[PDB]
Structure 1
């Protein structure tokens, strides 16, 4: 697994609609390229992927 350090998130746009109406940008630092899993830890917002 890749090691991820110093990660922050900023919200580009948000609109509380029925569809997926908000978009997130995450900044990170990694040692290798890889495929690994993202999650949200509340039901106030639902991710798509």
Structure 2
């Protein structure tokens, strides 16, 4: 498994809508390129994908959907951890077919 050190999390945009209306960016430092299993440890926010490609560049992105005004959840990438908190604005569409 790749060794992940100093993992930080920031949220680009958030909108608590039924579709996946969140963009999440992770910074990390690695030694080798591999595959990590990404999970979120709360049901306030639901990630879209299960595995991500970690590269020597030091940036991966994830998509999450949330329904709370201000989420706060702990996301893990292989063995690392972080705390992401964001501010989300309501969506404008009244009704959706999904």
Asked whether the two chains share a fold, i.e. TM above 0.5, the reply is yes
User: What interval of TM-score do these two structures reach, taking the shorter chain for normalisation?
Assistant: over 0.9
Figure out how many residues of one structure are paired with residues of the other and give that number.
48
Question: TM-score normalised to the size of structure 1?
Answer: 0.96
Unaligned 5+ segments in structure 2 are 49-98
* Structure with greater proportional strand content: 2
Shift of 1:40: 0.2
The higher-RCO structure (CA 8 Å, 6+ apart) is 1
* Cα distance in 2 for residues equivalent to 1:10 and 1:3: 20
Report the aligned-residue RMSD. 0.4
**Max radius of gyration: which structure?**
2
Question: TM-score normalised to the size of structure 2?
Answer: 0.49
